[PDB]
Amino acid sequence: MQNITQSWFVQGMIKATTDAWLKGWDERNGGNLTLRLDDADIAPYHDNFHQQPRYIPLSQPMPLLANTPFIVTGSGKFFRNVQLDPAANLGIVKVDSDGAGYHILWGLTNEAVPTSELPAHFLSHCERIKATNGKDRVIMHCHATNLIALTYVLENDTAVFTRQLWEGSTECLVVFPDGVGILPWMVPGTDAIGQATAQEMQKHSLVLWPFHGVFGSGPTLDETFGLIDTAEKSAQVLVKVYSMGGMWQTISREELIALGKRFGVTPLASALSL
Amino acid sequence: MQNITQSWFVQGMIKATTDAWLKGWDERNGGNLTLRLDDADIAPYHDNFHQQPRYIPLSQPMPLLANTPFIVTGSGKFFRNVQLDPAANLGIVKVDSDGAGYHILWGLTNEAVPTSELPAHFLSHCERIKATNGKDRVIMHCHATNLIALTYVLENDTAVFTRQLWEGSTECLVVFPDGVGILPWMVPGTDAIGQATAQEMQKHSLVLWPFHGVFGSGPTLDETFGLIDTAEKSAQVLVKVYSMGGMWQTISREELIALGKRFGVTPLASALSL
Amino acid sequence: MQNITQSWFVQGMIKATTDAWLKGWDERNGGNLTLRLDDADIAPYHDNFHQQPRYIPLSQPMPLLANTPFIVTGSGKFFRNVQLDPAANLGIVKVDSDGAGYHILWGLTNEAVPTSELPAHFLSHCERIKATNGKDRVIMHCHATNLIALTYVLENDTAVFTRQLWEGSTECLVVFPDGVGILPWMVPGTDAIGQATAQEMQKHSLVLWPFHGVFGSGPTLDETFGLIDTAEKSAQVLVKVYSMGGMWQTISREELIALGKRFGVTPLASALSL
Amino acid sequence: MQNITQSWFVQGMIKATTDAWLKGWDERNGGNLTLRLDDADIAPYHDNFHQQPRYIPLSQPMPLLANTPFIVTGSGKFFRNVQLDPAANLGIVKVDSDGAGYHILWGLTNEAVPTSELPAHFLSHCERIKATNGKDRVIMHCHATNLIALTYVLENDTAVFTRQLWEGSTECLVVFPDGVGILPWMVPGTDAIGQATAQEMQKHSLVLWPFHGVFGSGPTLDETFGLIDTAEKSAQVLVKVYSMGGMWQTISREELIALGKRFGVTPLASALSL
Ligand SMILES: [Zn+2]
Ligand SMILES: [Zn+2]
Ligand SMILES: [Zn+2]
Ligand SMILES: [Zn+2]
Ligand SMILES: [Zn+2]
Ligand SMILES: [Zn+2]
Ligand SMILES: [Zn+2]
Ligand SMILES: [Zn+2]
Ligand SMILES: [Zn+2]
Ligand SMILES: [Zn+2]
Ligand SMILES: [Zn+2]
Ligand SMILES: [Zn+2]
Incomplete structure (x- = not known):
């Protein structure tokens, strides 16, 4: 397909974080959201992926999530800005084969990391x-x-x-x-x-x-x-x-x-x- | 006329469900709305009708409403999404001649049914x-x-x-x-x-x-x-x-x-x- | 000038009634607003005027307001709809020379009258x-x-x-x-x-x-x-x-x-x- | 660059004053905001500057702020109108070399002054x-x-x-x-x-x-x-x-x-x- 920001999942993340913000539930960086995706969801947008995905270790091994892709909100990122700049406030990460860490395939720009x-x-x-x-x-x-x-x-x-x-x-x-x-x-x-x-x-x-x-x-x-x-x-x-x-x-x-x-x-x- | 979503009744349903949602009155699927229409209201939009209107029985016979068309919100449907996808969250239904059931002439896509x-x-x-x-x-x-x-x-x-x-x-x-x-x-x-x-x-x-x-x-x-x-x-x-x-x-x-x-x-x- | 709805006064009325509505101050027809204008404010829009201005008597003679033009909200009209249809919810009225009544020069369509x-x-x-x-x-x-x-x-x-x-x-x-x-x-x-x-x-x-x-x-x-x-x-x-x-x-x-x-x-x- | 209203700082001021207003924190002229800028931030917009910057004395000498540029909200100005007219509700001011006053280089039109x-x-x-x-x-x-x-x-x-x-x-x-x-x-x-x-x-x-x-x-x-x-x-x-x-x-x-x-x-x- 075309730009990943227009996909059902990024659009969904934008709608959800926006509605919550409008609800008065997520001031500043208070709040976070993660949606589990299938490889098939993100495959249409390969050309939007980072060519040198940053790798981040997990706090603890999570083998059942091995190879699983997710779209998440960033650490210190405001739900309010997601709609303004999806890529800087959202990231698609993929857990590695051992469930010991994940690669940021898209988003979380400016060295941003997933929610703490x-x-x-x-x-x-x-x-x-x-x-x-x-x-x-x-x-x-x-x-x-x-x-x-x-x-x-x-x-x-x-x-x-x-x-x-x-x-x-x-x-x-x-x-x-x-x-x-x-x-x-x-x-x-x-x-x-x-x-x-x-x-x-x-x-x-x-x-x-x-x-x-x-x-x-x-x-x-x-x-x-x-x-x-x-x-x-x-x-x-x-x-x-x-x-x-x-x-x-x-x-x-x-x-x-x-x-x-x-x-x-x-x-x-x-x-x-x- | 043209697209039924642009009719006075669908536009009215969108405005009403939207304002209510914005009021904080209809979280999730809490809430429902039904507007009685005349056949003349929906006639300009015959080409927007489903060719194989699904028929649904009524809980109990309602003869006085026989042959009456209505635009209603769907079961498990969010007032918040009406503006985003009228057809999936709204449906025009018409009670049959005995008032024993109704046909969904438009909307309520994905096998959706009227409000419970x-x-x-x-x-x-x-x-x-x-x-x-x-x-x-x-x-x-x-x-x-x-x-x-x-x-x-x-x-x-x-x-x-x-x-x-x-x-x-x-x-x-x-x-x-x-x-x-x-x-x-x-x-x-x-x-x-x-x-x-x-x-x-x-x-x-x-x-x-x-x-x-x-x-x-x-x-x-x-x-x-x-x-x-x-x-x-x-x-x-x-x-x-x-x-x-x-x-x-x-x-x-x-x-x-x-x-x-x-x-x-x-x-x-x-x-x-x- | 061009369309009166784009004038500083109609735009002002729309902004004011809209903000109030958004404030939760004007449900239904609760609330009303009137702004005194100079003949010079409305003169650029003569062609937008009603050709047969309806005349309405005042509850009581108000001679000091004789010949004074005002833009007002209508009776039973919702502040919420002003932005959607200015002319149906707003009217420019002009008090007659004796201050005994006023002519609706613009707006208040469908036989609408000023606020009660x-x-x-x-x-x-x-x-x-x-x-x-x-x-x-x-x-x-x-x-x-x-x-x-x-x-x-x-x-x-x-x-x-x-x-x-x-x-x-x-x-x-x-x-x-x-x-x-x-x-x-x-x-x-x-x-x-x-x-x-x-x-x-x-x-x-x-x-x-x-x-x-x-x-x-x-x-x-x-x-x-x-x-x-x-x-x-x-x-x-x-x-x-x-x-x-x-x-x-x-x-x-x-x-x-x-x-x-x-x-x-x-x-x-x-x-x-x- | 182009129009200063489209700069990161004016856009930021508009977003901030708007969100606050929407929060119900800044009714009327209640509230004010000032952001310290670098000369380099405003330099791309020299052609947007006032040719005869009005000079205003400070309440008291503030030498450490000498030569410092800031974008501020105006006195008696509503946070609500910033988005509608940035230049009339916002002003870029620059403190003089002695920190005894400042010149309004942009905005605060109609003789407006910074917040009291x-x-x-x-x-x-x-x-x-x-x-x-x-x-x-x-x-x-x-x-x-x-x-x-x-x-x-x-x-x-x-x-x-x-x-x-x-x-x-x-x-x-x-x-x-x-x-x-x-x-x-x-x-x-x-x-x-x-x-x-x-x-x-x-x-x-x-x-x-x-x-x-x-x-x-x-x-x-x-x-x-x-x-x-x-x-x-x-x-x-x-x-x-x-x-x-x-x-x-x-x-x-x-x-x-x-x-x-x-x-x-x-x-x-x-x-x-x-
Ligand atoms: Zn919090
Ligand atoms: Zn938390
Ligand atoms: Zn691949
Ligand atoms: Zn409920
Ligand atoms: Zn209920
Ligand atoms: Zn027919
Ligand atoms: Zn009331
Ligand atoms: Zn009242
Ligand atoms: Zn005239
Ligand atoms: Zn205050
Ligand atoms: Zn204050
Ligand atoms: Zn210079």
Whole structure:
């Protein structure tokens, strides 16, 4: 084809980072996005590739991702500028055959490197691949304001957050029936937070980093963005509700169960407390 | 005429879904819109029609809508993408002569189907047709944040919500003098919630689904959007007011009555409590 | 010149109504704007004029505005659509020689008429003309959310609202040193509310209609928009502050006085209480 | 090159003022921005220069800035109009050889002058130049809503604000490890507030003017905007949290310290209280 910036994947990355920015979720360099691609996606654009792809080691060996190409956001790069200069804020990287490093085949100009949260992204892509038998292809991280605020007031427990978020918007249980995982606060950009994030991803498509943000997984950019957006929307309702003094009525456990049955999903049981 | 995407109705659907999305009311696939058309509206675009219109059964027979064409949003489709690809997110469907199903004459590509809330839409279109002698042509559903938040704190009663919303913005009583109906929480996408919604529509142009969202009816897209927007605006004022501790002063019952008289409307009497 | 839609005044009206709409201040038909023009402003566009200008009587004789041309928003017209169709949502009207009615020389198509708040607009234009010796030319009304919310919690008194708003943003006393007038709630679209609004305008460039909205006056669209925007910005800060429980510290009376002296303005003394 | 409006610096100024405006930080003329340029930046555009550059005295001699060119926003000019008319809202000024005044080489048409906050800008540019050995080139002021609201509730102390803001978003300590300085309220547009601002800038890249706004410094427009945006984002989380009643859990002192170590920064020690 022609210019890679016009491909479905770069256009998708631009739309996603732009919408998130417009959402007020990604100030400065807060936030990151990675989409797993097939060699066939990037092959039409061979002539756009760097002739001397820079090689970068991975924090730790990730053999299951060996030879896998991804389009990712850069380290210290603003979601806001992606639309202005895709190549400087986005990069297509390909993990080597041992899953010990990757080559930047396109983008990330001016010596830019992938997001410092790559361990969380790649390790999670790994688990989601196994959890969904290869369906999930996107890991998205954003600093969703209301979800962040809620982590300072709600008990930081998967059951608690899952249940309250399900209560904050009817469709939530249907969009993320597996619930929302939550980690204790951890130093970001480390293999440790990445591994802890991947662990939650074995079950949850959404994972919260208290006082920091949210991680989401999905089969497409649209579905992954929509997943986070649904959770942040519910979080937004909850913040207003808690600000008005709390709930006087809410969706009941039995209603939540009837909802799950109707849409054919199996909701995280431990969140059906009360 | 030329391309149907450029018609007044597709352009209207794009503007409406776009504005709502920009309002933060329709994350993911949350929300739906249906506009009743005349055969004469779509006739200029016969060449844009599908040659093998897919036929889909209705949840239940709706004889009064027999042979009626509508432009609707799709199931699992994002209001945000309508502007990007009208045909994939919008569909023109025509109810068959028995009102037992409909043919997708245009749009809803990739085997997409109309919103799973079609029962609520179509059944409500039915009642609104009878209630307004054919004037209403639009049923719109959106997840208006503040109205949703208010359903967890305000008593879920038509009189209560109508009165508080009328108090939250002066023009409210004039825009929806018939008040705001409210249902108990129910499983969405069912014939039951649809029928319950239609029942409220016999009188109210606005109906709330607690912990879920709002339904509105109107003669045009602009008026229907404006109706919901007016209710959500008042809801927004109320949330701030309740968050500041509550009202110290407000529009009085007598003032509300003087307002109704001045604009020649008969306000829902049961909401003129106090 | 060429098409009147491209004139400085129609372009200004489009920019102003658009920015306000984007501010979330003018849902549906909530809000209105009128700009006083000179015959010389509209003369270049004679060929754009209606050949059979519709004549409309005024609610009451306004002789000082005799022969004065204005560009106004229409009744039931949405600020949101002005940019889409200026002529259908905007109209240039000219008051007759007795100030007993006006001719619609351009716009307000489809038999549209000026805003039902014209009495408040025109009567206020009258007082502002006298108060500023002809400098003010714009009267703008919008449903500024936070200012509306504050009218349910703050004592509805000019001194109270002026003082709190001055405290909510440092530049406020400098932008509206004459303070903010406030009326008791009144039926909108009446000669009575219009006259009451004009009365406040003899001194205040900003006037609040409790549970309804705000009126502002200024020499240009930019200054008038900026005035309201400054007041709504301060109101927004106050709502957050009151929502967090109230102020622990604030700008003091002496600081407010030093501020007035520094910028050479005489702040409304009755608001320098405490 | 060609037209100066298309240069990297004017385009940068337009993007920055536009994004801020869209953020709701710069209503009316609230806010200002100055970027230090090299003669080499403006030399390609000599033909765009004013032939009779107006000379304006400085509030006080600033010898270290002698012969330095800057692009600044104008006094009483709206950030919103920069994109519409760069030359009328922006000006390139050059300080004379004694640092006693400056010539307006381009822009600031219609006899416009630089922001009345120029003393705060220039004096701060001075300190930041010394503090960063010439790396910082931008001083930005904006009326960030949430940060303003917080100044009425949080103790106006550098340690307090720094600590709470670091707690309100994980990356904060990493983006501004030197903390946030805060001044007592002072009359704006004076040499006194400017000098007090510069003093804080010797250490802090962010300085708060209680009940007024925020000042930020940085090497580029993007980094400076991002810095303020990160602080306002954290402030936004805090306002929601305080509105919900306060924090139940938060980032701990030890976690904040581990965070600083991991990213190789030395966080303001006096903010690591508790
Ligand atoms: Zn962040
Ligand atoms: Zn992050
Ligand atoms: Zn190859
Ligand atoms: Zn929703
Ligand atoms: Zn819904
Ligand atoms: Zn036909
Ligand atoms: Zn309104
Ligand atoms: Zn109004
Ligand atoms: Zn003439
Ligand atoms: Zn301000
Ligand atoms: Zn300022
Ligand atoms: Zn030269």
